Ligand binder design. Structure first.
Ligand SMILES: Nc1ncnc2c1ncn2[C@@H]1O[C@H](COP(=O)(O)OP(=O)(O)OP(=O)(O)O)[C@@H](O)[C@H]1O
Ligand SMILES: Nc1ncnc2c1ncn2[C@@H]1O[C@H](COP(=O)(O)OP(=O)(O)O)[C@@H](O)[C@H]1O
Ligand SMILES: Nc1ncnc2c1ncn2[C@@H]1O[C@H](COP(=O)(O)OP(=O)(O)O)[C@@H](O)[C@H]1O
Ligand SMILES: Nc1ncnc2c1ncn2[C@@H]1O[C@H](COP(=O)(O)OP(=O)(O)O)[C@@H](O)[C@H]1O
Ligand SMILES: [Mg+2]
Lengths: 206, 131, 1592
């Protein structure tokens, strides 16, 4: 609680940034400059997509999670450094995807989470993003092919940015892209409109 | 009309219940250097101010009893006021005020000229009508 | 004022109270500072400011010289430490001596002195700073420990005691022939240094401590290297367990395990190394079964680690693929060692989840090794992740979930000691930041245990420091700038935080951005218990651990939600720790676990909880007489009886104090706690053979300053408290008694939070006491604390498991068993003895007594004491009655003796069980008693009494005393009736029976009266009567006992007399209010005197035995306002009697005796005494029955009103003329109206009283108008109290009012009929004996002015106290001056007290006692009392002198109370204020009074010029009614001020208008071009009338 006299003789604004998934992926990708081969850049791309997806899923309080968490840039830095260290100590290109999956789900992102339900939510999203399979359908529209073993990192950054530019964000991105049922986000919209209408009723009967 | 009621009271000591501390500032500006501000050796400085003949303003009205003779105007003429344990002369220019900023014993309530400053929906109506 | 200040400074001196020489010392700083707080004025102000600076220098110079004499006046090594520093302290000593000499025998010199004192303190601060920079492990200590260590230069001692504080895991230094060969760990382990540390006389402390610390690190490394090479050479671990310290074997085994598991993980081979590890575990277990204690600890810790190794290898073997095996191996801590690095101490690194950390080779000892659970390894992983980027590891979750222990285990595995901040309110900022900087500079790890328990300011202040540390670590900074110094920042430090959010707050934002939080809510209590049981040697450990965890879960889920229930992991580990001594007897199996669960958990459970425990124990689990026999023998020695419950609780307490050093016994009062632990202690003394010394200390009676000890605000000299004194006396053991005897300290009172905050560290694992002076007192193993409570409402959950808890859910006895024990004890308190004992014992036939007790519990008992606790009163009363009648028992038949014994037992039962009930309930109970014994025995009736031996009755004893006329003024004259004699007889029996009495009853029931009648006519007892108040202390009782008791050795308290026992009458014991923690000091003090017969002296700590002092009480029922119920632990020690209002027959008898006494003055109507008695009694009875307290708070009536009526009629007859029958009747009616109907609500109620009085006269006294306004009585217009005429009365009072207004004050009062009637009434009430006023009237109704006028007319003198910043000292000084003037001058006083001057209820209680008596005893004591007696002797038997003093006060004192609003509400219902002060209802003004006042005041203002007056008065009164009904009495202050302002404004405005009219007329005459002026003048003259009407 800030003091009342400080909050009185001032002009107050309340801000709301875009919850768009693709905008957050683009911001994370543009803020990153990658440097270790092509796989570090590929894993940074995967981590940016995962962080944007989990931050978008956080905003839906009753259905996306069970509470309101706050995953931020420091958590992204910790995960990125863990991927860099995993790629550095394992240069035989047999990447321990189980290691990064469990470490990100349980220690990096799931450290602050006490309830179990949110923990297998994070575990499911980690399993989807960091599956390490040949074909990766992150969302039902776009795919991220793995880097090939005859090129450099600049062309990989260009290719992933080109994949970003091709992507279009539909209006139902809060349920199709987050692997949520449509009835769940419909119920969330119903609850927010219900609390708004009920509060207007209480403010109107006075 | 609040100021008129305050300064048209020659028999009872006026009361200034002002939460914004604006009345104390305006009366200090009005009186200049003669304003002696106190709150609840305060008895000794009250006696010295009474002997000198200086206007005294006392804050914290909710914490009001040693000034009972002065608030009731019970003087002995031979004009002498017996404050504490010693009779003290009065120069005649002495005026007393009481201030409070927390919107009280019944003796304090029914012995002064209470003046109140408050804003409400009626004040909102009056202000917007004036505008 | 200047002369007084100069004289005070010239008289300023010093007191010789110090030790040795030192400085001369000063006391009473506060008075001197309060006294201290144009050229002459400027000089005086400069002198005062300089003096304040000098006193600041003075207080600071003894504040510094405390430590300076501690380290310099008794230790020359500090002052001779360094050469330049030696010269500096020599100059210090020279300056000290020179300022001492000039203080015994200057302004600039003393300014230079304080400047030099600041300089030398700064030099000492930087010297300690340099000492701390040389050895940064000094910086964990306080200043005094540093001074002691640096003074231990060539002594090599006392630096071996603080190394637990400095090093964390070192107990002591070992040294042989002035050389060091190692250190001792806390667990007793010895570390063998590689080479001896050679020591000479020319050595510095920090130098050899640096060598010792680096050599400790190198020696731990060397032992690790030797053990690692030996284990690499194929040598088994079973031979090297006993060779090196635990840390070396730990690290070597971990390195070998990591290397071997990686080598076997490169292929698919795990069974071989798994079998090797399992064989090592089995060999270690076999060696543990037959090893010494240090090897036991070593093998226990190695077994923790080897079970971890076995678990990891078993997890790795079951992996299907190599990828998941590599995943599982990457999650555990991995230990490696470097090879290329020639640096020894940085050669070992530790890998977890990919990242790497460093082993630091610090010595740790054998810590309690945490069991390796997967959650523990995940906590290790997240701590590693936080440390790898120089962040901070944070932990949050519920309380007691394994956070601080996880941080400590991480530190232990990484080869270092984690210094733990036990964060609470005790840690202030300077020590916390100091130990933070120590952890920074060393490189140690600081775990902030319970970080959410800090205060807000300290949390922010240290959050800034932790943020600075973390920001320095993150960017690789070298120095951090905190605490105004650029201290070094070692890059190996860290900060951990464990907290509990919302229990509280979360991590602050500035620390939230630098840390990495983690949630670890659920420990695995299954695998922890399994590994602990496997270590302890149980054959079946996994299934047993699962059973224990399941059973604890069922107890946590099924049992009740009591606060003291903890079924988590700490309780489980306590059970497991307690299993092993039971393993030594029962064996390794299920029986040991079951019996340990019974010994640990079952004492803390209730009754239904006990049934749940037994049911679940039978469902889950399948399933010494020497101490039982010794307990039975000790109980039969002590008189107790071994019931099954009592024996069970005794065995539980004995087996539970076997292990726990401090127990809590909880149970309802009277359940048997003290008997339990006294029996157990006696049996242990008989069985073991050790002597036992016991001490009982009630906690709440002594304050904490008296319990522990505190400084002096002027001298700073430590004084030992009681607990510190007894602990020091058992620590020293001067005589040698306390070397082979168990010592107990029983805190036989209620737990208190603020008291146990200083007890927690005493109860901590350190067994150390924290004192303000710095002394640390150890606790021996045989120093066991005991607690004895009845509730745990304010006990924190930190001490329910730290201290042992034993729960007494029910009584340990039947009623018959306690009856038998009480009988035997009372017999032992005493050829006739054996037959007497047999008769008293067998006359208690339990078959009828059971029905009697079950029929006595149901009746309505006031101050409800349980049926089990009336047995002491019943048995002791019966035994004392028979022992009093034993003299004439040898010459009576068995039938008559049996009947007499039966009657006395019936009387004891009736006055014990239902002595605390109403009259009708007493009749019902005596009917039950007569029924259940049978009709063959003697029937105890309502009035049966035994006279010497025959049946008698109380009705044939009462004396018909004939007091004369003028003894109705005396308030202590008791008219004896049947009830008074009955109550005095039962009071004598209960007093002589060595029992306390409580006299519960309504106000005016006759509690104090029957009390002082009983022990004023007695030659065997004396009274020290006390009236209690809201603010009562223990010292009040001692002050009351000061003049009646003497100290004899003081180890014993005896009365000053030699033949009469002393009785401590304590009236109104409900007044002591509860403290902030729900307890009262005075009633616990009373409980201490009545139960234990003695008390602890507060300045000397000695047991002052009570021999011949009794305690009785008399208090109103707790349902009344302003009263607080007392603890039953005290009231169970006092027999409770109930005193209701006397019946109509007794009332009529008493008041016909009073009317005979009053009509001896007028003998012509001597035959009409009885109808007057029935008149008064019937009038009061109707005034009570028809008028209840639901109408007003002052609708209370008692016999006090009848006595006041009799006194008023007496003073009116005495001060009146010759009286006819009609004059007598009208005088009685007028007096009844003035006493009773001074408070009735309306005119309707007063008319109801008038018709009641008319009916009373017509029924009893066979009449003119007798209203309040028709019986106009006065004595101002004549020489006697008679009916005077209204015209002359009003003329006289108006002339005297004119004299008053022209002589004393210029008050513009308005005279009216209500004012005349009320000044008449107040003059009447001030014309009596003991006249005081409770004037109920609204503000500005003329009450104070009327009182002053009446006091001026009657010749009284006026005093009005100046009551801010005034207290009882000034109030009593003013009252002493006033009473001295009254005694030495016969000057009748009118002491004015307003409701604005009653600030504290202590003033009210002072007047309350003043009006209970006609004086107060404790106002005059000592020198003032001697001076008063001398003045009485000069003006005029101590009893006769005090009686005359009481009489002259009661005749010559009139204090008045002015109240507007009826804190002051309890004054009205207070009984002793209700005694003589007359409550006058002034009333708020009505329409008639308002109109009359307005008409009288505005009549002197010309207004009839525009009738007007009545119309405007009606307007004003009706608008006042509308205002007060559209906006409690309604004040006329607004009304009177409005009328006054209107009067002055009309006069001034009419004068101004007259001047304007005169000027206009002059102008018109001068003017008489002109046509316009004439027209304007005509228009003005036409409009003038409307102008005047508009003006008004
Ligand atoms: N084994 C026993 N046989 C008979 N009477 C017993 C036995 N144990 C206790 N009593 C009786 O119980 C009474 C209760 O006194 P006790 O000192 O045991 O109470 P307590 O538990 O300390 O109570 P409190 O909390 O009020 O101090 C004793 O006075 C004694 O007469
Ligand atoms: N390996 C282990 N893992 C978790 N807890 C353990 C382990 N071994 C013992 N414990 C028990 O867990 C408890 C941890 O409580 P603690 O962490 O001190 O709570 P807090 O730090 O919140 O006060 C200790 O009492 C200890 O007896
Ligand atoms: N038997 C009696 N003889 C004479 N007076 C009595 C008797 N019983 C009651 N009274 C009157 O009742 C009043 C009792 O008041 P008191 O006992 O002092 O009240 P409290 O018990 O509250 O102190 C006394 O004024 C006393 O005169
Ligand atoms: N009936 C009255 N007529 C005139 N003045 C009054 C009257 N009652 C009160 N006052 C004013 O009030 C002052 C004192 O009132 P006081 O007797 O103290 O009333 P209270 O005891 O109820 O406070 C006087 O100086 C007087 O001027
Ligand atoms: Mg009394």
């Amino acid at each position: 609680k800030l003091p009342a006299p400080l909050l009185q003789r001032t002009d107050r604004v309340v801000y709301e940034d875009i919850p768009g998934i693709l905008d957050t992926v683009k911001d994370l990708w543009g803020s990153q400059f990658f440097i270790s081969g092509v796989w570090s850049v590929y894993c940074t791309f995967l981590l940016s997509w995962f962080h944007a997806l989990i931050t978008a899923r956080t905003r839906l309080v009753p259905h996306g999670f069970s509470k309101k968490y706050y995953f931020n840039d420091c958590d992204f830095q910790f995960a990125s450094v863990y991927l860099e260290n995993v790629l550095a100590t394992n240069s035989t290109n047999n990447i321990p995807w189980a290691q990064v999956r469990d470490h990100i789900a349980t220690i990096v992102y799931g450290g602050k989470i006490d309830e179990e339900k949110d923990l297998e939510v994070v575990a499911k999203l980690c399993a989807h993003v960091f599956c390490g399979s040949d074909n990766l359908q992150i969302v039902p529209g776009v795919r991220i092919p793995q880097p090939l073993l005859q090129q450099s990192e600049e062309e990989e950054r260009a290719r992933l940015t080109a994949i970003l530019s091709n992507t279009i964000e539909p209006a139902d991105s809060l349920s199709s892209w987050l692997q949520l049922p449509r009835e769940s986000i419909l119920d969330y919209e119903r609850l927010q409109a219900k609390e708004v209408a009920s509060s207007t009723e209480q403010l109107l009967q006075e | 009309e609040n100021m008129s009621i305050v300064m048209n009271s020659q028999d009872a000591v006026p009361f200034l219940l002002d939460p914004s501390s604006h009345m104390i500032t305006v009366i200090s500006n009005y009186y200049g250097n003669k304003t002696v501000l106190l709150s609840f050796g305060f008895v000794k400085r009250l006696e010295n101010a009474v002997r000198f003949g200086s206007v005294v303003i006392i804050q914290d009205g909710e914490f009001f009893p040693i000034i009972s003779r002065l608030i009731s105007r019970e003087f002995n003429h031979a004009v002498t006021v017996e404050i504490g344990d010693h009779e003290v002369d009065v120069s005649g220019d002495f005026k007393l005020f009481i201030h409070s900023c927390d919107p009280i014993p019944i003796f304090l309530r029914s012995r002064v000229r209470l003046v109140h400053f408050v804003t409400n929906k009626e004040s909102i109506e009056t202000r917007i009508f004036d505008i | 004022s200047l002369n007084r200040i100069k004289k005070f400074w010239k008289e300023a001196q010093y007191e010789v109270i110090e030790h040795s020489s030192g400085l001369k010392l000063v006391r009473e700083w506060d008075v001197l500072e309060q006294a201290c707080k144009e050229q002459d004025c400027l000089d005086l102000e400069s002198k005062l400011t300089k003096l304040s600076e000098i006193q600041v220098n003075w207080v600071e110079v003894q504040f510094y010289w405390l430590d300076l004499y501690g380290i310099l006046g008794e230790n020359l090594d500090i002052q001779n430490f360094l050469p330049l520093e030696t010269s500096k302290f020599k100059s210090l000593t020279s300056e000290y001596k020179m300022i001492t000499t000039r203080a015994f025998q200057f302004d600039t010199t003393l300014k230079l002195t304080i400047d030099s004192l600041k300089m030398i303190k700064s030099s000492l601060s930087t010297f300690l700073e340099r000492q701390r920079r040389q050895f940064p492990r000094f910086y964990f200590l306080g200043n005094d420990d540093l001074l002691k260590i640096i003074g231990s230069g060539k002594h090599h001692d006392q630096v071996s005691k603080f190394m637990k504080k400095m090093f964390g895991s070192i107990e002591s230094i070992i040294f042989f022939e002035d050389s060091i060969t190692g250190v001792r760990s806390v667990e007793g382990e010895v570390l063998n240094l590689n080479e001896k540390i050679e020591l000479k006389d020319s050595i510095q402390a920090q130098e050899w401590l640096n060598i010792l610390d680096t050599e400790i690190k190198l020696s731990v490394f060397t032992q690790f290297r030797d053990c690692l090479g030996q284990l690499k050479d194929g040598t088994d671990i079973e031979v090297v367990v006993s060779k090196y310290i635990f840390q070396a074997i730990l690290l070597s085994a971990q390195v070998m395990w990591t290397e071997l598991v990686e080598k076997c993980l490169q292929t698919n081979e795990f069974s071989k190394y798994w079998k090797e590890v399992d064989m090592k575990i089995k060999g270690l277990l076999d060696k543990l079964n037959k090893s010494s204690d240090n090897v036991k600890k070593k093998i226990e810790a190695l077994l923790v680690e080897y079970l971890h190794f076995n678990n990891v290898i078993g997890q790795l073997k079951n992996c299907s693929t190599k990828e998941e095996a590599r995943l599982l191996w990457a999650k555990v801590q991995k230990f490696y060692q470097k090879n290329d690095t020639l640096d020894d101490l940085n050669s070992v690194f530790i890998s977890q989840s990919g990242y790497l950390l460093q082993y630091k080779f610090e010595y740790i000892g054998i810590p309690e090794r945490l069991i390796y659970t997967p959650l523990l390894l995940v906590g290790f992983a997240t701590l590693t992740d936080s440390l790898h980027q120089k962040y901070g590891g944070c932990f949050f979750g519920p309380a007691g979930t394994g956070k601080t222990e996880t941080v400590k285990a991480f530190g232990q595995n990484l080869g270092r000691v984690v210094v733990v901040f036990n964060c609470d309110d005790s840690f202030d900022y300077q020590v916390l930041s100091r130990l933070l900087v120590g952890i920074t500079q060393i490189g140690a790890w600081g775990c902030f245990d319970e970080f959410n328990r800090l205060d807000e300011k300290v949390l922010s202040a240290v959050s800034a420091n932790i943020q600075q540390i973390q920001n320095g670590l993150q960017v690789g900074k070298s120095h951090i700038t905190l605490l105004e110094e650029e201290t070094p920042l070692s890059p190996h430090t860290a900060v951990f935080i464990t907290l509990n959010p919302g229990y509280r707050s979360e991590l602050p934002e500035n620390l939230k951005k630098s840390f990495r939080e983690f949630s670890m809510k659920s420990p695995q209590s299954g695998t922890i218990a399994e590994m602990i049981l496997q270590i302890m040697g149980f054959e079946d450990s996994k299934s047993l651990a699962s059973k224990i965890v399941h059973f604890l879960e069922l107890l946590s889920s099924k049992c009740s939600s009591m606060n003291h229930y903890h079924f988590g992991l700490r309780t489980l580990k306590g059970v497991l720790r307690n299993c092993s001594p039971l393993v030594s007897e029962f064996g390794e199996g299920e029986k040991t676990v079951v019996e340990s669960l019974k010994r640990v958990i079952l004492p803390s459970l209730g009754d239904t909880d006990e049934l749940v425990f037994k049911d679940e124990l039978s469902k889950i689990f399948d399933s010494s007489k020497a101490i039982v026999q010794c307990l039975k023998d000790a109980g039969q020695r002590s008189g107790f009886s071994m019931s099954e419950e009592f024996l069970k609780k005794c065995m539980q307490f004995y087996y539970m104090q076997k292990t726990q050093q401090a127990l809590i016994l909880v149970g309802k009062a009277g359940c048997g706690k003290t008997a339990t632990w006294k029996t157990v202690i006696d049996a242990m003394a008989i069985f073991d053979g050790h002597a036992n010394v016991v001490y009982v200390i009630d906690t709440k009676v002594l304050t904490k300053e008296s319990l522990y000890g505190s400084m002096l605000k002027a001298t700073l000299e430590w004084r030992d408290g009681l607990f510190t004194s007894i602990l020091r006396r058992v620590n020293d053991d001067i005589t040698g008694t306390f070397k082979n005897s168990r010592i107990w300290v029983v805190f036989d009172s209620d737990l208190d939070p603020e008291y146990v905050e200083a007890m927690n560290s005493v109860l901590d694992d350190n067994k150390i006491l924290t004192l303000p002076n710095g002394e640390r007192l150890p606790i021996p193993p045989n120093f066991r604390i005991l607690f004895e409570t009845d509730n745990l409402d304010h006990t924190t959950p930190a001490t329910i498991t730290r201290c042992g808890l034993l729960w007494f859910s029910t009584d340990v006895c039947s009623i018959s068993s306690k009856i038998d024990h009480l009988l035997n004890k009372s017999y032992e308190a005493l050829f006739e003895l054996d037959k007497l004992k047999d008769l008293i014992s067998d006359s208690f036939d339990m078959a009828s007594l059971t029905n009697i007790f079950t029929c006595s519990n149901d009746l309505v008992h006031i101050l409800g004491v349980r049926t089990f606790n009336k047995l002491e009163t019943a048995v002791q009363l019966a035994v004392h009655l028979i022992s009093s009648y034993r003299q004439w028992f040898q010459n009576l038949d068995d039938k008559s003796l049996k009947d007499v014994i039966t009657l006395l037992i019936k009387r004891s039962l009736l006055y014990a069980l239902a002595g605390d009930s109403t009259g009708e309930s007493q009749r019902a109970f005596i009917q039950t008693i007569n029924t259940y014994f049978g009709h063959d025995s003697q029937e105890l009736s309502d009035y049966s009494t035994i006279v010497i031996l025959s049946f008698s009755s109380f009705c044939s004893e009462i004396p018909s005393v004939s007091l004369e006329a003028h003894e109705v003024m005396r308030p202590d004259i008791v008219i004896p009736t049947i009830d008074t004699i009955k109550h005095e007889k039962i009071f004598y029996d209960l007093l002589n029976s060595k029992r306390g009495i409580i006299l519960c009853g309504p106000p005016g029931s006759g509690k104090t009266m029957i009390m002082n009648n009983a022990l004023r006519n007695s030659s065997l007892y004396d009274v020290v009567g006390i009236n209690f108040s809201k603010d009562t202390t223990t010292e009040h009782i001692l002050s009351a006992l000061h003049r009646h008791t003497n100290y004899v050795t003081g180890l014993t308290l005896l009365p000053k007399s030699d033949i009469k026992n002393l009785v401590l009458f304590c009236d109104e014991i409900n007044l002591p209010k509860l403290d902030k923690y729900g307890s009262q000091n005075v009633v616990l003090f009373l409980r201490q005197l009545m139960e234990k017969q003695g008390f602890w002296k507060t300045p000397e700590n000695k047991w002052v035995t009570i021999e011949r002092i009794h305690i009785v009480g008399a208090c109103n029922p707790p349902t009344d306002p302003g009263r607080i119920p007392m603890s039953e632990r005290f009231t169970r020690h006092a027999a409770i009697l109930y005193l209701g209002y006397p019946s109509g027959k007794s009332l009529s008898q008493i008041y016909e005796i009073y009317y005979k006494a009053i009509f001896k003055l007028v003998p012509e109507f001597r035959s009409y005494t009885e109808p007057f008695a029935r008149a008064s009694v019937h009038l009061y009875n109707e005034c009570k029955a028809r008028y209840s307290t639901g109408l007003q708070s002052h609708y209370l009536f008692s016999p006090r009103e009848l006595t006041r009526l009799v006194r008023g009629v007496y003073t009116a007859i005495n001060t009146g003329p010759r009286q006819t029958l009609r004059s007598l009747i009208r005088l009685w009616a007028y007096e009844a109206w003035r006493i009773f109907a001074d408070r009735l609500v309306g005119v309707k109620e007063k008319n109801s009283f008038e018709q009641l009085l008319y009916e009373t006269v017509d029924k009893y006294l066979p009449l003119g108008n007798i209203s309040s306004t028709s019986l106009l009585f006065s004595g101002l217009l004549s020489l006697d109290f008679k009916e005077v005429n209204k015209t002359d009365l009003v003329n006289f009072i108006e002339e005297r009012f004119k004299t008053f207004c022209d002589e004393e004050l210029e008050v513009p009062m308005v005279i009216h009929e209500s004012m005349v009637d009320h000044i008449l009434r107040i003059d009447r009430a001030l014309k009596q004996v003991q006249g005081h006023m409770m004037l109920i009237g609204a503000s500005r109704t003329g009450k104070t002015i009327l009182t002053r006028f009446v006091a001026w007319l009657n010749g009284l003198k006026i005093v009005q106290p100046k009551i801010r910043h005034s207290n009882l000292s000034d109030f009593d000084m003013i009252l002493k001056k006033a009473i001295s003037d009254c005694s030495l001058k016969e000057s009748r006083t009118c002491l004015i007290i307003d409701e604005s001057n009653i600030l504290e209820t202590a003033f009210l209680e002072r007047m309350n006692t003043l009006l209970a008596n006609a004086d107060i005893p404790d106002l005059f004591q000592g020198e003032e009392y001697d001076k008063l007696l001398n003045n009485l002797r000069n003006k005029t038997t101590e009893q006769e002198l005090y009686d005359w003093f009481v009489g002259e006060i009661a005749k010559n004192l009139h204090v008045v109370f002015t109240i507007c609003d009826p804190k002051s509400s309890a004054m009205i219902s207070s009984p002793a204020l209700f005694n003589r002060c007359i409550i006058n209802w002034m009333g708020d003004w009505d329409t008639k009074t308002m109109s009359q006042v307005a008409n009288n005041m505005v009549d002197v203002v010309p207004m009839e010029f525009t009738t007007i007056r009545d119309a405007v008065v009606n307007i004003l009164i009706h608008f006042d009614r509308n205002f007060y009904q559209k906006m409690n009495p309604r004040s006329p202050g607004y009304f009177i001020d409005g009328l006054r302002a209107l009067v002055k404004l009309v006069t001034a405005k009419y004068q101004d208008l007259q001047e304007n009219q005169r000027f206009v007329n002059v102008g018109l005459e001068k003017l008489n071009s002109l046509t316009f002026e004439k027209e304007r003048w005509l228009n003005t003259t036409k409009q003038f009338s409307k102008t005047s009407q508009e003006l008004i």
